[PDB]
Design a protein around this nucleic acid. Sequence first.
DNA 1: TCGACGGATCC
DNA 2: GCTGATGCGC
DNA 3: GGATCCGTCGATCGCATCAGC
Length: 275
Amino acid sequence: LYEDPPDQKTSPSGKPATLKICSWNVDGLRAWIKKKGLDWVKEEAPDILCLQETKCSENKLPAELQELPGLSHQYWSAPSDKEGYSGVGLLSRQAPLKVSYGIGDEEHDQEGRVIVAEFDSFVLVTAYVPNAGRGLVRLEYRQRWDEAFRKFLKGLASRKPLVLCGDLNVAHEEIDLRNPKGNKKNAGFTPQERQGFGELLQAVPLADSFRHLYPNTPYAYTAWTYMMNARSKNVGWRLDYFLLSHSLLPALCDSKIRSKALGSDHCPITLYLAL
DNA sequence: TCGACGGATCC
DNA sequence: GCTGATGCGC
DNA sequence: GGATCCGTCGATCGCATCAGC
Ligand SMILES: [Ca+2]
Ligand code: NA
Ligand code: NA
């Protein structure tokens, strides 16, 4: 079992956290709201909330989402021609300077996976990375995605400090899942997916916020299959990340795993920055 | 993720 | 709206 | 030749679609 440590809300130089970002693969936004997700969000009170795998077109967005005046600026992306699949959202207390959808590549911008929100001091990207598939049927596609995404993020980070959050659909290293041996040909732990993640960290470059602070902490996961009672056994994967520009590391206060928040087969993760 | 399967392969 | 089947996925 | 091993290999859970009416 795993117990996330208490929230560190001061920076390495003693500056108080001024910004709290929460990211959560809700795996069915309507179901997550029915499973009381927005109660949990309201007690966490983030300044920005990023959601993945909403599986909900904009028309079907439940009413409860306009009853949250702390996250009143809301942006949504859905697949162009495939309903109930993928989907992401970004809700913010303050309006961003600019919002865009996708990474600027037609091939990869059709499944509602990416929202980019530019603020004063940084750019925030939230992403739902495409799963490599059962039988690895989409691994070849995933490797092309990885190359296009890496390139996109490198470009962005060259202009403003970057924060990338969301479900990146890879457990980087053997410490990031419960059963590394049995999963090296399964989606999320292929050498191709792990190599892509490493290349992302090096080429942009980006740092893995949680591992920067807790480099040797095992059993810390963000996702558990619904089957086989995995979550109660903590047989999980760390698939949800906050990746940061190296320049933001002195602003980094903490990177949390909200293990006990139910409502999905992923738990939320939370980032504190002193900006 | 778990167990049932099968087909090496040591004692 | 309801049933039954298919898609997709830690 | 009875008992362990180790590469596959199906059925689980959950959400949302779709076809039909
Ligand atoms: Ca499928
Ligand atoms: Na390894
Ligand atoms: Na630096």
